[PDB]
Amino acid sequence: SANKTLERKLRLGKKIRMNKNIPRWVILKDKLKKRWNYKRHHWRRSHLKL
Amino acid sequence: KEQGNIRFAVDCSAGKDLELNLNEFADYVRTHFKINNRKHGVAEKVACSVEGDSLVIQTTGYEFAKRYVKYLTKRFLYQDYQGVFRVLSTDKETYTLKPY
Amino acid sequence: MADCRVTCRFHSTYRTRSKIVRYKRTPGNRLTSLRVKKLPNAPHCAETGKQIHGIPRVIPQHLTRQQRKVSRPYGGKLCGSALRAHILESFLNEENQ
Amino acid sequence: PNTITEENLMKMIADGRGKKLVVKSCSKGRLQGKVKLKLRTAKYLYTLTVPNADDAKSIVKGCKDKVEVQYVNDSE
Amino acid sequence: AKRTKKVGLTGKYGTRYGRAARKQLLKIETSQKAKYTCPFCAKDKVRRTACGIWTCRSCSKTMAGGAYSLHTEPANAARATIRRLRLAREDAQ
RNA sequence: UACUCCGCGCCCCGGAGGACUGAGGGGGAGACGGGUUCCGCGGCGCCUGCAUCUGGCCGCGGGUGACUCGGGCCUAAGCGGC
RNA sequence: CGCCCGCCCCCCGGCGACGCGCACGGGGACCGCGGCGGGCGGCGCCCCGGCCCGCGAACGCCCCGCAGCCCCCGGACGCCUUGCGCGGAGAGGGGGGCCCGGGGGCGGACCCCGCGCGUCCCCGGCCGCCCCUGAAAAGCCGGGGGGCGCCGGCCGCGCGCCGUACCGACCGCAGCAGGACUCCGGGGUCAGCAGCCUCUAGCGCGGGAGCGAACGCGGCUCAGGGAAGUCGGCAAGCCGGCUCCGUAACCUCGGGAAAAGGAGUGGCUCUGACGGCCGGGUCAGAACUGGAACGGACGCGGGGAUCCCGACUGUUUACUAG
Ligand SMILES: [K+]
Ligand SMILES: [Mg+2]
Ligand SMILES: [Mg+2]
Ligand SMILES: [Mg+2]
Ligand SMILES: [Mg+2]
Ligand SMILES: [Mg+2]
Ligand SMILES: [Mg+2]
Ligand SMILES: [Mg+2]
Ligand SMILES: [Mg+2]
Ligand SMILES: [Mg+2]
Ligand SMILES: [Mg+2]
Ligand SMILES: [Mg+2]
Ligand SMILES: [Mg+2]
Ligand SMILES: [Mg+2]
Ligand SMILES: [Mg+2]
Ligand SMILES: [Mg+2]
Ligand SMILES: [Mg+2]
Ligand SMILES: [Mg+2]
Ligand code: NA
Ligand code: NA
């Protein structure tokens, strides 16, 4: 909604900042086999419950 | 009160190069003017005369709006010279003719 | 213009008695909304429920001190008619009593 | 905004209460060649319309250098 | 009685409740819609406000009375009895 | 109820034509719920049950300003404490 | 009652602060008509007959403001509403005061001019209704008594914390013909916010081409007959707007009742009636004239005679029983 508490707003803020891929220089520095971050979410499919 | 003493002119000097003579224009206005949807009694109060630069319509004791003068001019130009010119206000009594 | 429909001016769209507007034309040829504030009642008599003369229908905070007073001994609490009865009643009673 | 009378115009200018004075020459319609004097005060903007242009020169000359002055004189 | 023969004000009920109820309502409603003389100013300006509350449209004096009518016969009998018993006591103190 | 011609491709964009929703709107805005879906630039590996040069899809950067609008105060039905 | 503004304590009050309704009146916005100024379109014939534009806020000061309520003189079959209602506890008349979410003028800001029916919203005074009477508190103010004393004008500063993008992008396993609260609401036809066409705004949605068999789904017409069909008139069909004429048995006297059943309705050219110191529509009558046609689409009762059950309006097995 457009009328939220700051407490709910801060927990949703962290979810957005975390929805990122694995950086390219990290994949090769650590010699990673699996190159996708499976803790990502999509707004049309998820239920954050926050 | 319809005191008349109204003046209206159409500056046709801008179309001087083309072949639009003010006498045929004056006759058209005289022949097809209408007062109260009736063509009689018009020589009594409506007079249009060729001047140096424009046709001048002088009326005594009668009233009407510039729109009518615009309507008559456009009908004449429809007879000949269709597609060219335009009729634009330039003062509180006169008009003008400028190409598209 | 061919369309004169507006949009709500308040936080929500529920039309309660404190959410009434009227429409006026602005200098930019636009139709605007203005609140219609509630008009409070002027003070009413204590003995009777009638309205007391001389005080306008505004909240007392926005009036000067002179504008919310009446120049009489009980002014603003009771009407002139009710004051006569109390004066007559007290005098006639204390004379006999 | 409120209207002001002539006598308490240069009085206000006397108590140094005006912050600016604007002169504008109106020459169309019911404002026929008359001028409006607009004085900016701490609380209100006060305006006077002298009935003739001549009266403007005298009053403004009666407060020259006492309050900063503008001119408009729109002619369009 | 130009419009009805007998229903009177109970014509608002159509044909919906029966004869006994309609007769009783005729009596009661006629009584409760009436105008009564004010005991304080002798004018016929008393009207019902609630079940047992009657108000005068002239003097603005409010009274407690019966439902459907300003006075009831038991109340008149009681007032007369009180008035009688009040005088007998005041003669002998 | 429904698209067509040309640029250019039945689906994107433009111009021209032909239609529709029909002021209880397939219009313009809020509450709740959602949580970045919003904007610009680029793209077609996935998805867009046909296609796609399109996109609520993918990548990179951005974006929400209050003395006067709402909440913070009051008390309702209630709840808690004693 | 007015005009230029004292605070604290105790007590007495007020404001905040309140139902529903058919009507009637006022204001605003919308809408339409005519005039004047500016711009445009089309033009086989007509065309001063078409289209678009012509704007004015909060706030300050001065005037006006119907109904309502009050003051003075004086002493009555009168005043007055659509409806009512009021008067010796003081009417009419004459002269005044108060309130009125409003209007006008001047500022804000160098304002095209007149007129009118209706629609929506708000307000007003009445009347009606109830074995139904239609919140509270913070906060603010007044009066009485007591105790105290500049309290206003000008000029300066200041006003912390949090929300704020966008969406029917929400829930139904999905970009699911379901479900999902509220606000603003033009033109024509019309009783109408119904049905039908449309300005503004928005927009062509699980893809296309060919062919024109059976059969299905959704529609249309049909000679003569007219329920013979079938458990059963199921389905479909008939009727239907408005005006006038005419309406039975029975009855709880209120109904039955739109009972039943008849006739008219287009276009054009005219006539009369109803107001005000120009406007408006409606109602009534006549001539002429169209394939014996006119509620020409749309919208919109089939009726009657009886028996059983339950008096009636209402409620019910969400997903087979109303
Ligand atoms: K915002
Ligand atoms: Mg006063
Ligand atoms: Mg349509
Ligand atoms: Mg929005
Ligand atoms: Mg987007
Ligand atoms: Mg994405
Ligand atoms: Mg506020
Ligand atoms: Mg705040
Ligand atoms: Mg926003
Ligand atoms: Mg779920
Ligand atoms: Mg859906
Ligand atoms: Mg048979
Ligand atoms: Mg058979
Ligand atoms: Mg059937
Ligand atoms: Mg039943
Ligand atoms: Mg039923
Ligand atoms: Mg069931
Ligand atoms: Mg069923
Ligand atoms: Na187009
Ligand atoms: Na409709």
**From the CA of A13, how far away is ligand 6's center (Å)?**
17
Tell me which residue of B88, B90, B85 sits closest to B19, measured CA to CA.
B85
Strands (DSSP E) contained in chain E are 36-37, 44-50, 53-56, 62-64
| Interstrand relation of E53-56 and E62-64 (parallel, antiparallel or unpaired) | antiparallel
Q: Which chains touch D (3 or more CB pairs under 8 A)?
A: none
The alpha carbon of residue D76 and the mean position of all alpha carbons in its chain are separated, in whole angstroms, by 20
Residue C32 pairs in a beta bridge with C24
- Long-range pairs, E33-41, Cβ under 8 A, ≥24: E33/E9, E34/E69, E36/E69, E36/E70, E39/E63
- Quote the CA–CA distance of E91 and B5 in Å, as a whole number: 111
- Quote the CA–CA distance of C39 and C58 in Å, as a whole number: 7
Ligand nearest to the CA of C8: 4
**From the CA of B54, how far away is ligand 13's center (Å)?**
99
Helix (H, G, I), strand (E, B) or coil at D47: strand
Helix (H, G, I), strand (E, B) or coil at C84: helix
Residue D27 phi, psi (nearest 5): -140, 40
The sign of the torsion formed by the CA atoms of C79, C85, C91, C97 equals negative
Chain F: nucleotides below 7 Å from protein CB are 23, 27-37, 56-60, 69-70
Question: Nearest nucleotide by C1' from E18 CA?
Answer: G252
Tokens of D67: 């309050």
Strand order in the sheet with D31-41: D2-3, D45-50, D31-41, D18-28, D69-71
Which residues does C79 contact at the CB level (< 8 Å), separation at least 6?
A: C45, C47, C48, C50, C52, C53
Question: What is the C-alpha radius of gyration for chain B, rounded to an integer number of angstroms?
Answer: 13
Q: Give the alpha-carbon dihedral of D43, D45, D51, D55, to 10 degrees.
A: 80
**From the CA of B34, how far away is ligand 14's center (Å)?**
69
Angle between helices B66-79 and B22-32 (to 10 degrees): 120
Is the CB of residue A3 inside 7 Å of nucleic acid strand G? yes
- Residue A3's Cβ-side half-sphere holds a number of Cα atoms within 13 Å equal to 2
Q: For residue E34, count CB atoms less than 10 angstroms from its CB and return exposed for 0-12, middle for 13-18, buried for 19 or more.
A: middle
Helix (H, G, I), strand (E, B) or coil at D61: helix
- Is residue B33 within 8 A of residue B46, CB to CB? The reply is yes
Q: For residue C34, count CB atoms less than 10 angstroms from its CB and return exposed for 0-12, middle for 13-18, buried for 19 or more.
A: exposed
Chain G: nucleotides below 7 Å from protein CB are 1-7, 12-18, 27-31, 35-43, 47-49, 53-61, 69-71, 85-87, 89, 97-101, 106-111, 121-122, 129-133, 140-144, 152, 154-156, 162-167, 169-171, 174-175, 182-186, 199-201, 252-255, 311-312
Residue with structure tokens 């003739």? D52
Strand order in the sheet with E62-64: E36-37, E44-50, E53-56, E62-64
**Burial state string for C65-77 with b = 16 or more CB within 10 A and e = fewer than 16:** eeebebeeeeeee
Q: For residue C42, count CB atoms less than 10 angstroms from its CB and return exposed for 0-12, middle for 13-18, buried for 19 or more.
A: middle
- Quote the CA–CA distance of C71 and C65 in Å, as a whole number: 12
Can you give the resolution of this entry in Å? 2.5
- Quote the CA–CA distance of B64 and B4 in Å, as a whole number: 9
Q: Which residues surround ligand 2, an ion (CB under 5 A)?
A: C 54
Tokens of C8: 């709500």
Method: cryo-EM
- Quote the CA–CA distance of C47 and C53 in Å, as a whole number: 15
CA E27 / C1′ G252 distance in Å? 17
Residue D34: CB atoms within 10 A of its CB come to 17
C75 annotated among ligand-binding-site residues: no
Tell me which residue of E60, E29, E28, E30 sits closest to E43, measured CA to CA.
E60
Listed in sequence order, the DSSP H helices in chain A are 6-17, 24-29
Strand order in the sheet with B4-11: B46-50, B54-60, B4-11, B94-96
